Each structure stands twice: as structure tokens, then as C-alpha cells.
Amino acid sequence: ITGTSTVGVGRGVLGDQKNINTTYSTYYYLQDNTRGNGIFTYDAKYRTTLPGSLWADADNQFFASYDAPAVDAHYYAGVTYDYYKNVHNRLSYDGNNAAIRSSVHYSQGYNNAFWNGSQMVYGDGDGQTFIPLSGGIDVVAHELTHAVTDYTAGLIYQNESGAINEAISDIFGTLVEFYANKNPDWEIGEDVYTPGISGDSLRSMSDPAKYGDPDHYSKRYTGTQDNGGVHINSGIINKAAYLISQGGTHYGVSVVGIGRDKLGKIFYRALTQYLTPTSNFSQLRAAAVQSATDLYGSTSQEVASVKQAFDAVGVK
Ligand SMILES: [Ca+2]
Ligand SMILES: [Ca+2]
Ligand SMILES: [Ca+2]
Ligand SMILES: [Ca+2]
Ligand SMILES: [Zn+2]
């Protein structure tokens, strides 16, 4: 909508207070004009018709229980935008400042979130398995990263290319969580997962097997469930990325870690320069090796660590 840029205040899913960029035009709208061509947040009103209504508020204060998922979807979309702009010089998900749109209160008891090809969508959860999923910054960044992938490598959402697609979203979801620097970790979804169970998460990048996901290519899932295990076999790539950053010895193969920032540069370069819709795990390794070579040189520790990491998870 046309209006004037304003700044509201509210509370997110976890009870924390934050300021949010809004737009005034009779009502105050969750429309942030400070980032590219706008970040827009919508109310799906417990239904499945998308996007719903652009979120309107009478007084620019967002402290109602019903407001909380919208506050976090809106605010964490902005953080993710800032990450890609400041760290990777990428303007929104298409590289040309496309509007970022999100809908919250999707359906009833919906224990998921997703990028639907054009926008983000967040359930409120059922209060047992999940609380409203926009409360997790790694969830928000995970899903917006799908938009980035779909515009760049275009990895097909099945089998190994789909597992790479999922892993890329976990990797940059985690790096955005570290970038915002609020209780960062190598776990996925911990802030909105199982409110009655402390210390768990949906997936682990540091130890995928913690939740039954493979941590080595020999353990990969080869059936047809989950579009050929896209959320399962992602553990193999997640483990490789964790090793590249943090280091470790995995099934006897030692990896010298090179840090989060270099992990991000290597995988962003691989995603945007070398990966294709049909890339498999071995092709990802080659993309990452070439990316590290471009960035740091053929004889660098960085290249050596990429090789060791993919060796450790059995990807040749
Ligand atoms: Ca209000
Ligand atoms: Ca965390
Ligand atoms: Ca996390
Ligand atoms: Ca939990
Ligand atoms: Zn995903």
C-alpha cells in the first residue's frame, strides 16, 4: 500500500520485544519499505487461502497473542534480507530486490512452514509438536533460502538434488541464526519445537544421527518416502558443512575447521555459480572444491578442508 514508513513495536512468539518496520495509511501495516521493494506480512486467518490479508493494526503496537507470529515472520524476514545483502551482496532472493511476502496463521494446528514458490507460509503448530514456526529464525531463513535456491541452482526437490536443496536451507538458516547471534547453534528448529521438551530439535547438523538422519553416504535413504529422503539425506550434506566450519574427526577422517564465514562464502558461491537443477552429492563436492579454489587458492587450507569433509561423509 502507499503510505509513510513508520516503526512499530511488539512481542514475538517467545515473548521478546522488538521493533518492526511498518507503513501508515489509516491503519498501520506490516509493510517494511526499508529493504528492497518491501517485506510484506499477511494474515491467513486460520485458513489455507493465500496470501490472506496484508496485516493491518490500528495503533502500531503488536503485543496481542495473535500478533506474535506476524511480528516474528516480519522481523526475521528482515534479518534474513540483511544477511544476504550484507554478507553475500545479494538483494533479496532473486538478486533484484523482489518483495518478500509471508503469511502466518496458516490453517489450524499446522505443524509446518514452507516456501510455496512465491511466498513464505507459517503454521501456528498444534502447541505440542510446534508453537508458531515463525518464532524460529532458522526456520524463517531456511524457507527464504528455498527462494534463493529456486532462483539460482534450481535444485530439483527429489533424491540427491532435493537433499542438497534441503541442506542448503539448513546451512544458511543456521548461518542467519549465527548472524543474528541469539542463542546460535547447529540445530534446526529448536526455538519452536516441542515446547514441553528441553534441548531437542527437528534436525542436527552437528550430529544428524541424533534424530535418525544419516551422517555418511553409506547410510543414505534410498526409498521413495519424503521425495526420496530430501529431509533425511540432507544430514549427509549438513554434516559435511558442519565439519568444514567447525572441524572434527568423523569415522576416522579428520577435518580442520575453517569457520562459519568461509563455509558461507564457499557454499553461496557453489549455489550461485556451479550447482544446477540435477546436481548430485558428488557434483556438490566438485562445486564446493571449485568454489573454495576460486576464493582461497588450490593449495589453501580451505580447499583441503572441503575435500576432507566430503571424504568424512563418504562423498567422492
Ligand atoms: Ca495493535
Ligand atoms: Ca538457537
Ligand atoms: Ca538453530
Ligand atoms: Ca523442544
Ligand atoms: Zn526445506
Whole-angstrom CA distances from 211 to 110, 235, 301 are 21, 10, 31
- Element (H or E) spanning 1, and its range? none
Question: What distance in Å separates the CA atoms of residue 266 and residue 244, rounded to the nearest whole number?
Answer: 10
How would you class 97 by CB atoms within 10 Å of its CB: exposed for 0-12, middle for 13-18, buried for 19 or more? middle
| C-beta separation of 32 from 39 below 8 A | yes
Instruction: Quickly tell me which residue has 572441524 as its cell.
Output: 247
Which residue among 143, 160, 250, 302 is the active-site one? 143
Helix axes 159-180, 68-88, angle to 10 degrees: 100
Residue 302 bears catalytic tag: no
* Annotated binding-site positions for Ca(2+): 57, 59, 61, 138, 177, 183, 185, 187, 190, 193-194, 197, 200
CA–centroid distance, 194 to ligand 2, in Å, is 14
Q: Ligand 1 being an ion, which residues bring their Cβ within 5 A of it?
A: 57, 59, 61
Question: What distance in Å separates the CA atoms of residue 101 and residue 144, rounded to the nearest whole number?
Answer: 10
CA–centroid distance, 287 to ligand 4, in Å, is 35
Question: What distance in Å separates the CA atoms of residue 278 and residue 147, rounded to the nearest whole number?
Answer: 17
Ligand number nearest CA of 204 is: 3
All three cell numbers of 306, joined, read 572441503
Q: Ligand 4 being an ion, which residues bring their Cβ within 5 A of it?
A: 193-194, 197, 200
Residue 231 bears catalytic tag: yes
How would you class 223 by CB atoms within 10 Å of its CB: exposed for 0-12, middle for 13-18, buried for 19 or more? exposed
Question: What per-residue string of b and e applies to 20-51 under the rule 16 or more CB within 10 Å gives b?
Answer: bbbbeeebbbbbbbebbebbbbbbbeeeeeeb
All three cell numbers of 187, joined, read 540445530
All three cell numbers of 93, joined, read 532472493
* Annotated binding-site positions for Zn(2+): 142, 146, 166
- C-alpha 211, offset from chain centre: 19
| C-beta separation of 276 from 297 below 8 A | no
| C-beta separation of 111 from 136 below 8 A | no
All three cell numbers of 242, joined, read 558442519
Whole-angstrom CA distances from 149 to 6, 222, 278 are 32, 23, 13
* The dihedral formed by the CA atoms of 185, 187, 188 and 190, expressed in degrees to the nearest 10: -80
DSSP letter, residue 99: P
The CA angle 252-258-245, to the nearest 5 degrees, is 70
Q: Is 52 left (phi over 0), alpha (psi -120 to 50) or beta?
A: left
Length of the chain: 316
Whole-angstrom CA distances from 117 to 48, 81, 100, 145, 252 are 15, 17, 12, 12, 41
CB atoms within 10 A of CB 118: 12
* Annotated binding-site positions: 57, 59, 61, 138, 142, 146, 166, 177, 183, 185, 187, 190, 193-194, 197, 200
All three cell numbers of 288, joined, read 564446493
CA–centroid distance, 166 to ligand 2, in Å, is 18
Q: Which architecture, in CATH terms, is 6-154?
A: Roll (3.10)
Ligand number nearest CA of 174 is: 3
| C-beta separation of 54 from 45 below 8 A | no
Contacts of 271 (CB under 8 A, 6+ apart): 148, 149, 152, 153, 168
DSSP letter, residue 270: H
Question: What distance in Å separates the CA atoms of residue 5 and residue 267, rounded to the nearest whole number?
Answer: 35
Which residue among 105, 231, 250, 302 is the active-site one? 231
Q: Which of the listed CATH numbers 2.40.50.100, 3.40.50.2300, 3.40.605.10, 1.10.390.10 matches domain 155-315?
A: 1.10.390.10
CA–centroid distance, 224 to ligand 4, in Å, is 29
CA–centroid distance, 167 to ligand 4, in Å, is 21
Contacts of 17 (CB under 8 A, 6+ apart): 9, 10, 11
All three cell numbers of 246, joined, read 567447525
CA–centroid distance, 26 to ligand 5, in Å, is 37
Contacts of 291 (CB under 8 A, 6+ apart): 265, 266, 267, 269, 270, 273, 274
Contacts of 95 (CB under 8 A, 6+ apart): 151
Bridge partners for 11 per DSSP:
17
Bridge partners for 17 per DSSP:
11
Ligand number nearest CA of 58 is: 1
CA–centroid distance, 139 to ligand 5, in Å, is 9
User: Is the torsion defined by CA of 209, 211, 212, 218 positive or negative?
Assistant: negative
| C-beta separation of 153 from 288 below 8 A | no
Q: What determination technique applies here? A: X-ray
Q: What is the resolution of this structure in A?
A: 2.0
Question: What distance in Å separates the CA atoms of residue 316 and residue 310, rounded to the nearest whole number?
Answer: 7
Question: What distance in Å separates the CA atoms of residue 305 and residue 55, rounded to the nearest whole number?
Answer: 46
CA–centroid distance, 143 to ligand 5, in Å, is 6
Omega prior to 277 cis, within 30 of 0 = no
Minimal CA–CA distance to 207: which of 184, 227, 188, 183? 188
Task: Collapse the DSSP code of 288 into the 3-class scheme (helix H, G, I; strand E, B; otherwise coil) and give the result.
Answer: helix
Question: What distance in Å separates the CA atoms of residue 85 and residue 87, rounded to the nearest whole number?
Answer: 6
- C-alpha 208, offset from chain centre: 17
- The residue extents of the domains of the chain are 6-154, 155-315
User: Is the torsion defined by CA of 190, 191, 192, 195 positive or negative?
Assistant: positive
Whole-angstrom CA distances from 44 to 104, 107, 120, 146 are 6, 7, 12, 21
- C-alpha 311, offset from chain centre: 25
All three cell numbers of 251, joined, read 569415522
E strands of 85-179, at which residues?
100-106, 113-115, 120-123
